[PDB]
């Protein structure tokens, strides 16, 4: 199966101006038995402002 330990990504929010970046969110679905979930739950990217 290989289930992802994070939920899927939310949509990118509106571009923040004039810094020129937007963000999107995920959440942890489960931690592994041997280690915490290491997939990202927050991401930023540059956008036009």
């Amino acid at each position: 199966a290989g289930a992802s330990c994070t939920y899927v990504w939310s949509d990118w929010n509106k571009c923040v101006c004039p810094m020129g970046y937007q963000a999107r969110h995920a959440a942890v679905k489960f931690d592994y038995r041997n280690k915490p979930c290491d997939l990202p739950t927050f991401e930023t990217k540059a956008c036009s402002c």
Partner: protein, 173 residues
């Protein structure tokens, strides 16, 4: 600050106690995969001990005994000032959820509320923005009051400083 570029720092405690003011474009985040029983309450407190400032209470539609006029609905409590229904995507204790709260301009406190159907997880999140009807002030705290929150996680953006070493707040020793 705590990072060269904006990132969300996990808070190893039971609540997020921000030191200072909520700067615009910074945020506090609370997530969970669901909860076990009762209502889900996302709360915001302020100093002066401490006092409640605003609370979002969401009643599950999948719990027997919840009154019909509350099931599947969320309510915004302000301090008490009043309580009023708000349109949020959280409908069930079986839903995953995310609270992302920030100040849009250094005054108003608002939250983006996300919900995901655990039976249709590939469909993603539904989101609604709710104004908390209160203004930001120094040393706000954010947390959850619910029975059996699953995989509860707390974050504070790197431009904010949150308490991470107070055992009174459940911080990991």
């Amino acid at each position: 600050s705590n990072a060269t570029f904006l990132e969300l720092v996990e808070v190893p405690c039971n609540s997020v106690h921000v030191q200072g003011v909520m700067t615009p474009n910074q945020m506090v985040k609370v997530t969970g995969a669901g909860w076990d029983n009762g209502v889900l309450e996302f709360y915001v407190t302020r100093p002066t001990s401490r006092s409640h400032l605003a609370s979002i209470m969401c009643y599950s539609k999948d719990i027997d005994g919840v009154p019909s006029d509350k099931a599947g609905k969320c309510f915004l409590k302000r301090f008490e000032i009043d309580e009023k229904e708000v349109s949020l995507p959280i409908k069930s204790h079986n839903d995953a959820f995310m609270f992302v709260c920030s100040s849009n301009d250094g005054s108003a406190l608002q939250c983006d509320v996300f919900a995901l159907d655990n039976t249709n997880s590939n469909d993603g999140w539904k989101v609604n923005t709710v104004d908390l009807g209160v203004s930001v002030s120094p040393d706000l705290a954010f947390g959850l009051t619910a029975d059996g929150v699953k995989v509860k996680k707390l974050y504070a953006s790197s431009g904010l400083t949150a308490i991470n070493d107070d055992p009174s707040l459940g911080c990991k020793a």
